[PDB]
Amino acid sequence: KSAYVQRGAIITSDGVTLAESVKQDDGTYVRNYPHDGMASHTVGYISTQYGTAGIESSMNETLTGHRSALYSMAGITTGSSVVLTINSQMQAVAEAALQGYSGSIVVMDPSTGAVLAKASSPSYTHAELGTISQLVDRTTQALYSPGSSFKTVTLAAGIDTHKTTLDTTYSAPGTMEIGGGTIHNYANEDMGTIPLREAFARSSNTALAQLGVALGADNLVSYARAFGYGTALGQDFSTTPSLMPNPAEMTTWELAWASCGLPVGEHASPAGPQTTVMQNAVIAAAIANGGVVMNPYIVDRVLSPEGAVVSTTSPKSLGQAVSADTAAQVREAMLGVVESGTGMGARVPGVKIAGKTGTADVENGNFNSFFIGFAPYDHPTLVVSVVIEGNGENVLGYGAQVGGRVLAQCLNIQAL
């Protein structure tokens, strides 16, 4: 029966139709994808060979459309349409910034969790699914070691528990023994004794590991969970949960590394942290939003075949991960990263951008570049989360450059 019932459309917030059904002279309907290639992973597909993904999958009941003994009357009833929170201009900006690279970008509204752009690369067209890495959604369904981008969580926790302050000094030596193994700063750089805001801006592992060990495993895990770890984020799309160990299984050395964003644990529970890019955006959004974590969403509203609004998504909080005072301090620390530390590549003349960078080593001596951030600093209206994957190219600092560029172009779009 269901080939004769028209499937609803998938449309961006600014009115660009990305999926559509057209009636045949046969009476059946064929699925068409205008601007084929835009937001492919988000729009998704239903394919015997390739599976299901994206909105075609997650909103399938709504688009399908819930007397039936007559196939001739099946036409008389239409699926309802879905208007996404994705803006086509911001989507194009994120897609352009990934050309030539593997990785992904999420742009989100920090006060609501609305997903404004969501891009993964390499990508595909729907036309390609009619023949025989591209199908993986690297924003929500790939896990990465977050590296130093996770120090945002460590810092937040340290401040929120009143165990440290941005002006508290730490020894930040090139190497240090912790829990019977070694932690080293990048390039074994000895930074001497410096305030935490500077250790964070310059991304010292030896300093941040000492904070992680002061916090303890229970605290670190609990705060990661409060930011969304362990939750399949997304009101209306699938995200694979970001992972932390069972804190009871962690060692001190493991803890030290985890607090710098490197999963090195060996135990029954997973090693962590392992993050999605979406989870990283949710962390930046919580910090930008006074500590309030939002469950992100990608559907704005549902429309009936006649264009009436049938329902509207409501923003929903997953709780307050840290206090407002803590969030303000973390924002300030993040401003330092971009103004005077490892995130200077994200600077954009005439707008204050804040963020945190990371770099993580993976298999075969490859490494990935991360960035989370928000803008403008005072009254944030956008959050970005990026991963640029190395795969045998050095991409040091690329996440930050991509991040700043996307924030700046997205701010301009907002201004129009």
Ligand X SMILES: *C(=O)[C@@H](NC(=O)[C@H]1[C@@H](C)ON[C@H]1c1c(Cl)cccc1Cl)[C@@H]1N[C@@H](C(O)O)C(C)(C)S1
- Interface residues toward ligand X, by CB under 6 A: 147-148, 184, 186, 203, 205, 260-262, 342, 357-361
Q: Which is nearer to ligand X, 36 or 339 (CB)?
A: 339
Give the largest Cα separation in the chain, rounded: 80
Q: Which is nearer to ligand X, 148 or 295 (CB)?
A: 148
Distance CA 13, CA 85 (A): 5
Q: Which is nearer to ligand X, 155 or 294 (CB)?
A: 155
CB of 144 to ligand X, least distance (A): 10
User: How many whole angstroms from its chain centre is CA 236?
Assistant: 15
Q: Which is nearer to ligand X, 106 or 258 (CB)?
A: 258
The H-or-E segment that residue 371 falls in is: strand 367-375
Distances (CA, A) of 19 to 63, 85, 303: 11, 15, 14
CB count within 10 Å of CB 122 equals: 14
CB of 368 to ligand X, least distance (A): 9
CB of 386 to ligand X, least distance (A): 12
Q: Which is nearer to ligand X, 134 or 394 (CB)?
A: 394
CB of 21 to ligand X, least distance (A): 45
Q: Which is nearer to ligand X, 228 or 399 (CB)?
A: 399
With beta carbons less than 8 A apart as the criterion, state whether 108 and 116 touch.
yes
Q: Nearest-CA neighbor of 307 among 66, 78, 32, 24?
A: 78
CB of 202 to ligand X, least distance (A): 7
CB of 53 to ligand X, least distance (A): 29
After which residues does the chain show a gap where C to N exceeds 2.5 Å? 66, 76, 132
Residue of closest CB approach to ligand X: 148
And the tokens for 50? 């390739």
Strands 81-84 and 10-11: parallel
CB count within 10 Å of CB 223 equals: 21
CB count within 10 Å of CB 35 equals: 17
Q: Which is nearer to ligand X, 299 or 407 (CB)?
A: 407
**What is the sign of the dihedral through the CA atoms of 33, 36, 42 and 47?**
positive
Distance CA 55, CA 44 (A): 6
Q: Which is nearer to ligand X, 6 or 359 (CB)?
A: 359
Q: Nearest-CA neighbor of 92 among 170, 22, 37?
A: 37
CA angle 347–229–380, rounded 5-degree value: 30
CB of 167 to ligand X, least distance (A): 21
CB of 175 to ligand X, least distance (A): 10
CB of 209 to ligand X, least distance (A): 8
Q: Which is nearer to ligand X, 203 or 210 (CB)?
A: 203
Secondary structure of residue 383 in the 3-state scheme: strand
Question: Which phi and psi angles does 127 have, rounded to 5°?
Answer: -55, -40
Instruction: Provide CB contacts within 8 A for 225, sequence distance 6+.
Output: 231, 244
With beta carbons less than 8 A apart as the criterion, state whether 414 and 93 touch.
no
CB of 385 to ligand X, least distance (A): 14
With beta carbons less than 8 A apart as the criterion, state whether 296 and 278 touch.
yes
Q: Which is nearer to ligand X, 54 or 261 (CB)?
A: 261
CB of 189 to ligand X, least distance (A): 9
